[PDB]
Design a protein around this ligand. Structure first.
Ligand SMILES: [Mn+2]
Ligand SMILES: [Mn+2]
Lengths: 189, 187, 185
DNA sequence: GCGCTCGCTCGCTCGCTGGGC
DNA sequence: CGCCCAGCGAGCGAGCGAGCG
């Protein structure tokens, strides 16, 4: 049961959108669910609002092309350094590596149309599948589930902004630092 | 007119029933002076298929039917192995690997019933280095007299060619001995 | 901020090498130069100028660093005319310099030499950390310029080019060269 | 030093794949 | 049903350079 990784960068500005009027980005207030132990004040809501649409729309489209509704996914939204970015992990089922690119460009175009009103973002490499090499000419990387505990779960605030999954073992972990800490230590095994 | 070299290992391998490997009896053609008793027939039977299927496929990918080749099957200390020499025409070095895998796969399907052989490095193109990162080697015709023709029994098992100058030499020790000595006469 | 060094040799034979365009450019020292125009050989300089201009055009393409720092000095050596090209390492990892420099080398041959490789032994050579085989591509820092390039005087010094602010004046000025050498020491 | 070794790098090649039209 | 062509990615091999003796 392997995963492809797509990294999607998210800015702080957007089209259309402006603070002087009502828009879909600014109108959304976010709340942590009861079972979260995170600090809402370190979570930047406008970028999170955009991220949520992007991953929701990504997975809707993904399910169309893969013909696998119920495909397993783990999505984590992060604040770098330079850019906000989302790691999207999506199960390979229904999408042979040979054919991922032609499908991801359909999804990429759809996201531009719907979220960005037809205007491609100017962020440098804003929609990028993870390859087996740093340079040109590698294969689309397939990572197994252990990527999540090894690389995603350890992230803490404010780098960690939000996460989403339909994987049972990680539902609790998405927004719980203590549960993240537990699965990380339980994975060293 | 240069050659690529592919070395294909063949194993020493059911006896309770009829199969294509065991059913074949081999005989030396009349013009051969070799000793049939030093030739191991089950491995030779497999080798013949491998080289026949190799060259059928090679012709497809090269678009050169009538491509020149020399194939020699040998018994080493460890493994039986065949040296396949095939003319470079139609197959740039950049592109040899992608084509040889297609051939390798076809051999596994047809001869090995889809089960890859467990022999260590059983299908190996000759490179310009012993390690990784060299080029595909191109040898000219003189490789045959220098390195292939001198082999004698039981190291020499069999050979095949469509090169007019070496037809006689395949299975004739005296003719091998002659072309070897005639090749030094040229140096 | 380090530099790779490429040494490019340039041949002596206006004529009759049959490449007559080296004769057709007249050179002038800019006003601020104190050099003697009569000790500057213009046909070889004419070629050298094209070589370094084209080298740096190509260097920018492969490095993806327009505005890369460089210092180029053209010399009349004991054996050949040659230019020392110093170019900033940015954008070009040492592992990959060779594959890029051959592209540049081939470009120069096509464009300056009309496809005919020069017969000068070793005419396009990166500086290594050893005299023999098996060393690394050398990285020198800026101080190479004052220590080894700036002291050269006429007629060994023929010409220089740079986009480094501190050395603009020094390219064609012996007094300014003399000053930066003493200020460095 | 100095000639050589050999595991490794990565920009680039180009026949193949298979949705879209 | 047959082309188109963006995506594919193993294979390529000159170049690399610490290490060896
Ligand atoms: Mn042998
Ligand atoms: Mn010098």
């Amino acid at each position: 049961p392997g995963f492809y990784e797509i990294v999607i960068k998210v800015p702080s500005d957007l089209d259309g959108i402006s603070d002087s009027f009502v828009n879909w980005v600014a109108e959304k207030e976010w709340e942590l669910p009861p079972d979260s132990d995170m600090d809402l004040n370190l979570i930047e809501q406008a970028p999170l609002t955009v991220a949520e649409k992007l991953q929701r729309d990504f997975l809707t489209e993904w399910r169309r092309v893969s013909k696998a509704p119920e495909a397993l996914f783990f999505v984590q939204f992060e604040k770098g350094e330079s850019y906000f970015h989302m790691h999207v992990l999506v199960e390979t089922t229904g999408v042979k590596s040979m054919v991922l690119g032609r499908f991801l460009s359909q999804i990429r175009e759809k996201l531009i149309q719907r979220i960005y009103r037809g205007i491609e973002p100017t962020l440098p490499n804003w929609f990028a599948v993870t390859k087996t090499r740093n340079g040109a000419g590698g294969g689309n990387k397939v990572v197994d589930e252990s990527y999540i505990p090894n690389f995603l779960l350890p992230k803490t605030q404010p780098e960690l902004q939000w996460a989403w999954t339909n994987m049972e073992q990680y539902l609790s972990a998405c927004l719980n630092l203590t549960e993240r800490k537990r699965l990380v230590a339980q994975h060293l095994t």
